[PDB]
Amino acid sequence: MWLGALLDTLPTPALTIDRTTARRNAERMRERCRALGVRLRPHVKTHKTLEGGLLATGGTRRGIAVSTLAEARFFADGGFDDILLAYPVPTARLEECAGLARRLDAFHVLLDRPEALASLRQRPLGHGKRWLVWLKLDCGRAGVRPTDPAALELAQAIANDAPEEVTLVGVYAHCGNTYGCSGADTIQAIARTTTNAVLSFVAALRQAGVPCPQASIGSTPSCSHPIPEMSQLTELHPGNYIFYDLQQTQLGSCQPQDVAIRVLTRVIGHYAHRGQLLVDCGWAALSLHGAGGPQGCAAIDGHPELRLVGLTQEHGLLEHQMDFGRFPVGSVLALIPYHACATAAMHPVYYVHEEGKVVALWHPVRGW
Amino acid sequence: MWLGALLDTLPTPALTIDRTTARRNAERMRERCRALGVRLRPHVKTHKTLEGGLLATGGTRRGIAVSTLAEARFFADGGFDDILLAYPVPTARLEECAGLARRLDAFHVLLDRPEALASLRQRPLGHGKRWLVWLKLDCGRAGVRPTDPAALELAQAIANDAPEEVTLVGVYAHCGNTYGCSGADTIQAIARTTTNAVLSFVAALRQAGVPCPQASIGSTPSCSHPIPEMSQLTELHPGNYIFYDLQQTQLGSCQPQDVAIRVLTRVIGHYAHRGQLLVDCGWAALSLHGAGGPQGCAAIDGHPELRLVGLTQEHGLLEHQMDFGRFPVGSVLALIPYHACATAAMHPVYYVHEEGKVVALWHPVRGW
Ligand SMILES: *Cc1c(COP(=O)(O)O)cnc(C)c1O
Numbered sequence: 001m002w003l004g005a006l007l008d009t010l011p012t013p014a015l016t017i018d019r020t021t022a023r024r025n026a027e028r029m030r031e032r033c034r035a036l037g038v039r040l041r042p043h044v045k046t047h048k049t050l051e052g053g054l055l056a057t058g059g060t061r062r063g064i065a066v067s068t069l070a071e072a073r074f075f076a077d078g079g080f081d082d083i084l085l086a087y088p089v090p091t092a093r094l095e096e097c098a099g100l101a102r103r104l105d106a107f108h109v110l111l112d113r114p115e116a117l118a119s120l121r122q123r124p125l126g127h128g129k130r131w132l133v134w135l136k137l138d139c140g141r142a143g144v145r146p147t148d149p150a151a152l153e154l155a156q157a158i159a160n161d162a163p164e165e166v167t168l169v170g171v172y173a174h175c176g177n178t179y180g181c182s183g184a185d186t187i188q189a190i191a192r193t194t195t196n197a198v199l200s201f202v203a204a205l206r207q208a209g210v211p212c213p214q215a216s217i218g219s220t221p222s223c224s225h226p227i228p229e230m231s232q233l234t235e236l237h238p239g240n241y242i243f244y245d246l247q248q249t250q251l252g253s254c255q256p257q258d259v260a261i262r263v264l265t266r267v268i269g270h271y272a273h274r275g276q277l278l279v280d281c282g283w284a285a286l287s288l289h290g291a292g293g294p295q296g297c298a299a300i301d302g303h304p305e306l307r308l309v310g311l312t313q314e315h316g317l318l319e320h321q322m323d324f325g326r327f328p329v330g331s332v333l334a335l336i337p338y339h340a341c342a343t344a345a346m347h348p349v350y351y352v353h354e355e356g357k358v359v360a361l362w363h364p365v366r367g368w
Numbered sequence: 369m370w371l372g373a374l375l376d377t378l379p380t381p382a383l384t385i386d387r388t389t390a391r392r393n394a395e396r397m398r399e400r401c402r403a404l405g406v407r408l409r410p411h412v413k414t415h416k417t418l419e420g421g422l423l424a425t426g427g428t429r430r431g432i433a434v435s436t437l438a439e440a441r442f443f444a445d446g447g448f449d450d451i452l453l454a455y456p457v458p459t460a461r462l463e464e465c466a467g468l469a470r471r472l473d474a475f476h477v478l479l480d481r482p483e484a485l486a487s488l489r490q491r492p493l494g495h496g497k498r499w500l501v502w503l504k505l506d507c508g509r510a511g512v513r514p515t516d517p518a519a520l521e522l523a524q525a526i527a528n529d530a531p532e533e534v535t536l537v538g539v540y541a542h543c544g545n546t547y548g549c550s551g552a553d554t555i556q557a558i559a560r561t562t563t564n565a566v567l568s569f570v571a572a573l574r575q576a577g578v579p580c581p582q583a584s585i586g587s588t589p590s591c592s593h594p595i596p597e598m599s600q601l602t603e604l605h606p607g608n609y610i611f612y613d614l615q616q617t618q619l620g621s622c623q624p625q626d627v628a629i630r631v632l633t634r635v636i637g638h639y640a641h642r643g644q645l646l647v648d649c650g651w652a653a654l655s656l657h658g659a660g661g662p663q664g665c666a667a668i669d670g671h672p673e674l675r676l677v678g679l680t681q682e683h684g685l686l687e688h689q690m691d692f693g694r695f696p697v698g699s700v701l702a703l704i705p706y707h708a709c710a711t712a713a714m715h716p717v718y719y720v721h722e723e724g725k726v727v728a729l730w731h732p733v734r735g736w
């Protein structure tokens with residue numbers, strides 16, 4: 001246990017979260033939504049922590065999105081509610097989904113196939129509770145396409161075919177496509193194509209008389225530079241924005257000062273005959289994200305000079321011709337990881353801090 | 369808890385270990401060593417499990433190699449001893465190394481820099497115990513080069529400069545270079561270059577009068593096709609061979625029938641308009657190894673037809689023109705992962721099985 005400890009005292013490699021930066025990130029996204037007049041349902045997958053969720057959620061512990069039944073359970077066990085399982089409802093685990101729907105005032109699920117509706121229908125929740133269902137629209141990983149007349153029919157069914165057992169809460173899209181882009185304008189165009197598609201669908205839905213009270217989109221890059229059409233929605237659900245990361249910096253969603261995550265590592269050897277620094281951060285601590293070479297898995301914070309050039313499980317090699325005097329063995333560097341969600345999943349504890357000193361330890365759940 | 373359960377009953381994605389194949393793998397490597405007349409010190413990093421270690425070690429719980437102080441501790445807490453920390457001794461965590469050296473009859477460390485020796489010297493173990501030190505030879509990630517006269521001097525010091533506080537147990541190389549190769553002959557050439565280098569060093573060591581009783585090398589690929597010169601060593605320390613994996617199959621260390629690990633995943637959606645299967649195994653469950661694209665992170669066991677073409681955190685996309693009838697939603701596929709050590713690190717439990725039925729659950733340690 002390390003309360004109060006100075007950062008470069010921790011056993012590395014060690015994932016670190018600047019609680020100042022995080023709180024700042026949470027409140028900033030809360031305000032954007034306030035500004036747009038819509039609700040924020042933060043996704044928890046970058047941190048999978050109660051504390052994390054608590055920040056995102058402004059202290060309220062209600063209205064979030066999870067990627068696994070593990071997180072659902074964890075969050076439910078920690079007192080959260082209004083929990084959306086942002087994932088095509090897993091028909092092979094319905095006893096569990098029903099379990100949570102019964103504990104919770106509001107447990108929401110998504111689906112995108114008529115068969116999924118069938119499966120729900122044959123596992124009625126009972127107790128007056130109805131399956132709160134959202135229709136995942138693909139505007140291109142999963143969901144139904146809004147122009148496919150099949151989407152309309154499916155909405156129709158979820159909403160109406162059994163209103164005592166199933167209800168259509170809204171439509172749900174995740175504009176993840178914004179990750180292949182580059183710079184704010186193409187981010188916004190994907191936001192716009194997605195916002196408008198969704199808006200047209202709902203238009204079509206009102207016209208046909210299919211009640212659909214909510215409409216959800218969002219990803220860190222589109223919600224980092226929100227666009228006016230968005231206020232015609234009811235909720236945005238980004239998540240990663242609480243931490244941010246190198247990729248997010250490269251995309252333009254944020255400035256470096258916004259990235260709350262680092263992986264602290266130590267210089268544990270010099271290698272003059274190959275000009276390389278040796279660090280105790282391998283990929284067990286960092287993950288291979290941003291490689292498919294290693295140069296782009298991470299940046300050495302405060303040191304454009306150095307770049308990662310190798311990663312074994314428990315080692316990384318750094319290069320500059322070098323300067324080993326500036327980097328005595330035992331000195332700590334701070335790696336800026338490419339994909340926050342991925343680094344986060346390699347750590348059983350996060351060292352959370354303020355003013356260089358450790359202030360808390362968050363423990364994420366994992367598994368399925 | 370799932371004792372006895374049928375495999376395709378498990379909550380996927382789920383890492384699975386064929387205990388038959390594993391036991392077979394353990395005994396096979398035990399026999400190779402018996403044949404060569406040398407000792408086997410299995411590395412535990414592919415599984416990081418007590419059960420795992422127990423197999424490798426033939427039931428004895430002695431003589432293994434770990435990659436982190438976490439594993440050291442775990443194994444020590446589980447009754448193992450003769451534990452080699454196969455890693456340049458971490459000078460910033462010496463209170464802990466000393467801790468374990470004091471609990472254990474035999475805790476071994478490696479180093480490759482004179483300064484490391486200094487640091488050990490100023491943290492004497494006391495209690496009559498001496499730091500059991502091995503000299504990591506680089507024959508090309510870390511260690512000293514055997515032709516560099518500095519290596520000789522360092523051996524000299526470890527062995528002799530303070531024989532009441534520090535002793536040189538042997539020399540240690542890891543012929544990891546065999547991972548860029550391809551086919552048995554270049555594997556063996558790297559084995560040979562490494563074996564001979566090591567043998568020449570020890571020759572030089574005897575000549576100079578530096579006592580060096582042990583000599584350790586090994587990696588799964590060189591120990592999968594051992595070479596005669598190896599019997600002039602005292603110990604081989606591979607590890608991954610207990611599980612094996614796709615990469616190992618591609619290299620030629622093993623035949624498919626040898627790979628004991630799978631990640632079971634489910635078909636949870638069809639996508640005719642893009643010809644794709646949707647599976648609940650994303651990279652949270654598989655890792656991005658073998659990508660730097662996704663085609664090569666894994667193979668669909670029993671189905672050369674399909675290949676992985678996308679991986680998000682909790683999803684993978686499969687392609688063939690398809691045949692969705694052969695793959696009803698809910699049917700289970702078995703992914704063969706590229707790098708066993710990496711997939712293993714994404715799982716908090718391994719479902720171990722025999723004859724299709726689950727026989728145990730191993731829980732690996734993690735962290736640092
Ligand atoms: C991760 C995720 C989100 C969150 O979006 P980010 O861009 O990661 O902040 C939203 N919806 C789904 C389905 C997700 O998996």
Ligand SMILES: *Cc1c(COP(=O)(O)O)cnc(C)c1O
Nearest residue numbers: 411454542587588606607608609
């Ligand atoms: C992983 C490791 C080994 C084990 O070799 P494999 O080829 O993975 O079986 C041996 N020595 C060191 C230092 C290692 O990190």
